[model samples]
Target: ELKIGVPLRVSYKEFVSQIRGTENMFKGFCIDVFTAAVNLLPYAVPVKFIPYGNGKENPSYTHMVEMITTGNFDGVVGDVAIVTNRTKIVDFTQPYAASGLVVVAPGGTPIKGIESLRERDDPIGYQVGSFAESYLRNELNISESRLVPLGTPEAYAKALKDGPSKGGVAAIVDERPYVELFLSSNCAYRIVGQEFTKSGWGFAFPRDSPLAIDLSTAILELAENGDLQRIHDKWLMKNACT
Candidate 1:
């Protein structure tokens, strides 16, 4: 059986549910894409999903990839990004979702871009241990005093809704799909500006693993057949902000 590591740090709606207290039964958008890709393959890939986090705080995604390199998992089936550094130790399937960091502000706020964030005394928010958190700190050079790192999606919503006067954030940064999901439910928030970075979500496998190539081929088929877009719409397009 192939041991797969699944990160547990997901927005509430993005995380569908757990069954029988087992991580293997996890269902959601990422799982759906993985399942669909596996179905496209000619041969069966027996797999087990192992939860990577304690279900409270968001886990470090880079650490999760390290698990694959260290023999803890054969692959990772989640919303892991395909980036330059990770490719050195692990292989990635073709990107199933085009994703990048985006900023989300309240419905009425005039937050047009990253520059608007500098005008606020309130802290900017992002998920702890997520790529956006580090991007804000390291790439964007946002100060620690002006940053609020939350653990869960709910924490982000609360902070945004509360605003700075209530000890919350002036803006929150996260992945585009996740932010779209948030906007779908909240109806009072909007993503501002284009995504600042370019990235894609892909399944990770151990270096030189055959599954990586096989799954990448399957992903391409799904993309060509429109199954990929259909699955994405099923989960992400069900709600509207207005």
Candidate 2:
């Protein structure tokens, strides 16, 4: 039997959520897709899933990358971004989900870009290691002191809720999948009209692993046969912002 590790990103609402009183066990979007995809492996892949971290914390991708390279499991299946830097450590399949960065703020915050945020004289924050931070820093003229580098998505989400007067940003920029829930939660958060970065979420495997290629084909089949969308609908049918 093979083992697969799922990185939680709350941790992909569709893939896995803590089942209360338990931190490891789960059932949701990624599990279904991984299981269904494994079934199409031309032969039984015989795999079981184990989620990374304590179910309530952000996963350490570096540790998981080391584990996959050292044979802790076959690969990673969940909302993992397929970026240039991450690919250096592990190979990725054709993305099974979309990936893009987004900016969000309290309802009616009127933030379109850097200038608007500056005019408000309120701070803006972003996931520390994410592309949003770099795009804001390298591309925009905002002062380094005014821009906040938040440690986790949870922290940044809190920043938006706390608002400008309470040491929080007027907005927090994060990945789209993570940001959508904030808008849908009826918490007075709405997405800005600026735009989103282009990327996709892909399954991660050890560099040069053959399983990566096969699973990409498996996912392709799942997509073509219409099972992928069916599975997605079964788990993530609604998340507010379209």
Candidate 3:
């Protein structure tokens, strides 16, 4: 049995939706890839999906990392963004998709990009233990004094709306959809500036697993054959990073 970790976040809903009608069949972009990869191998691998808490709520990638390190699961399959720092602890396959990091700022604010916040001495909120927070700290060159790492995305968003720091948070670094969902419709937030980082999303495996190579190869083959694009078009085309 091969254990695969799936994200709890709805960003992966496209992949999870496929399993709705099936009794025991695996479904979703990552699920489909996992199925195809196992089929390509000599044996029929039974997959066990181990779920991780939502990134927005948990915020710490390390929580999932601990699960992998402890051998509770063999690998993770989800819309996990690749980060250089994460590779230090776990191994990841080549990305199946790419998206840039964006900042969501309060709407009506003149903040157009990262540069707009440089002058602000105190920007109050961020998602604690998230790559988004790290990206802002390192890429934006903001001083440590300006950062406020909160426990949840809701707290982070609320901070932007109502905080002692009259300036509120200068920005929120996240995938395009979070801003599109919360800020665009209900709040006065807008994505400002060019994307900060062009990150890729990939599957993760333990430090060393023989299955990793097979899985990676299968993913590459799928991409070359347009299977990856078909999957993306089927589920992600409309809600893609725009």
Candidate 4:
């Protein structure tokens, strides 16, 4: 059997979600994206998905992607996106979806760009060990001391809901998928500021894994056949917030 590592999607609604835990199990746009691609592999073999992130709704890809190199899984099949630091260590297929990082703030905060938020003293929130934090620090010149590192997007959102005075955050910086989820559901928050960077999501594997090329070809075929879009329409088109 082949094992695959899957990171929890930060959006919590987009790529992958398990609202009912093991009862509902794992199934989503990216889930189909992976399953279909694996089925198209030239050689037939058994495959199983191994969820990473320590039971988090939104797990750290940085931690989970490492498992591939340590002989734990053959590949990842979920919302794991491509990044420069991650690409250094892992090989990824061609992107299957588009993504970008955006800033979000509590309702009535009067804050827009991250530059404005830097003027505030209260901590800003972001997923721990994610590119969102890196963007806040490097692109916006925000200090790490000002960031409130939450392990999940659900937590980051809660921090914003709690507000600045009660151990809550004034702002959040994370992937646009999550921003979309937030804006659609919570009328009290708003996505502020322009997206500083753009990226695409893809399944990941250990560097130069023998399966990389074949999987990429398979994914392309799935996309061309509209199989990938079928999954996307089912899982990604509806916003839970709406």
Candidate 5:
């Protein structure tokens, strides 16, 4: 049996649902990708999803990836980004989706990019342990006092709606897929600028795992067969903002 650790976040990428008399159902973009990849493989790999976060909060993906090294999981699925440090500890499949960082602010705001937040005293929000938080801290050197580590999509929406004037964050920096997902539901907010960094979503496994190699090949086939774009459109583009 393949025990896959899935990052539990509220977005187009993942959905955790439970029914009264049924097993917990994991659905949405990332799950769809995994399902498709599994089907493409020549042999069947019995799989079970082991959620890796507090149901209400976005978990530290860095920690989730490390669990594989410690023998906690056989592989990691769901919108896990292929980051440099993570690559050292886990082998990531070929990127299944391109991703990057983007800034978001309330509608009609003058925010243009990451630089705009740096010059203001108003606080900014980012998911705890996300690449966006790391970028703001290490790259932009934003003060911790002015940085708010937020969790959940509701928190992000509430913070932006509150704005800095009401003791809330003035802006939020996050991954583009999540920002786009957020925008689809909350039309009151808008992305401020082009993606600042290049990244990609990939499945992770223990270093040099044959499973990672096989999955990467499966992902490549999915892309070539147009299943990647088809699945992406179903979740992300269908309800996307204009």
Candidate 6:
């Protein structure tokens, strides 16, 4: 069985629901790609799904990465992004999707852009182990003192609603769809400025996994033949990277 770890993020609700419900067993963008690739291979591999928490939750991404790095699982499927530093530790398949980092805040909060946040003395809340957190720390040059790392996306969102940081915390780093889906209830907050990171979503594997090449090839072929666009349109077009 090919063990694939998937995150329980709302962005993937359709994909996960289809996988769980049927034996035709193939629906949604990533599932279709995986289905086609496995069929093309000489061997018939049965897939076993392993449910995992979203990286926004503490220990989820880190634990999964450690598992893959140590060869404990075949692969992990989620909204995982490709980063140059991470590539040094693990290999990633060709990008199945592209995304970017957005800043979310209370609608009328004076914060206007990334630069404005840097000026604030208050801490910004981001999920503890997310790529968004890493980007803010390593790439954005924000000081450690200004960071408020939270345990989960839900916690981060709740903090925004209930804390004084609602006015004090300048922004939270997250994908566009997440900000749109959950924070829309507040209507008080809006995504500010252009996106920060231009990220490519991929499946992660061990650094030397031979499967990386095959998966990458399959993804590129799908993209070239317009199948990728079709799948992406079905699930992601509305919130695609700008």
TM-score of 3: 0.72
lDDT of 6 by residue, 147-231 (tens): 7766544665676776454543567777654555445445556788878777677778788887777778877777788877777
Off by over 4 Å in 6: 8-29, 40-43, 53-59, 149-157, 162-168, 183-186, 236-242
How close is every model to the real structure, measured as TM-score? 0.89, 0.78, 0.72, 0.82, 0.89, 0.74
- Where does model 4 exceed 4 Å of error? 8-14, 17-25, 107-110, 118-122, 138-140, 151-157, 239-242
Candidate 5 lDDT, tens digit per residue, 1-242?
97888777643443323222434357777888888998988999898878787766678889999999999999988787888889989999888889888889976665777777788777899877586767677788888788898776788899998888887788998888778778888888889877888789888988888878898889989999999989887766736566
Query: What's the residue-level lDDT of 163 in candidate 6?
Result: 48
Please give the distance, in angstroms, between residue 139's alpha carbon in candidate 2 and its true position after superposition.
Answer: 7.9
* Tens-digit lDDT string for candidate 3 (91-139): 8877766766776776666567766666665464555545776766686
Clashes of each: 0, 2, 4, 0, 0, 2
The per-prediction CA RMSD against the true structure, in angstroms, equals: 2.2, 3.7, 4.5, 3.3, 2.3, 4.4
Cα error, candidate 2, residue 144 (Å)? 7.6
Worst 10 residues of 1 by lDDT: 11-20
1-242, model 4: which lDDT tens digit per residue?
77877665544646676545562257777877777887888788566776676454467676788888888988777776688877888898878877887778864665787667777666888866576776677777888888888765567668888878889888887778767755666766777888766887888877887677687788789889998778777766644443
lDDT of 1 by residue, 128-167 (tens): 7676766776777888788888876678889988988899
TM-score for candidate 4, residues paired by index: 0.82
Q: Which scores higher on lDDT, 3 or 4?
A: 4
For lDDT, candidate 1 versus 4, the one ahead is 1
Comparing 2 and 3 by TM-score, which wins? 2
Q: What lDDT would candidate 1 get against the real structure? A: 0.80
Candidate 2's displacement at residue 186, Å, is 2.5
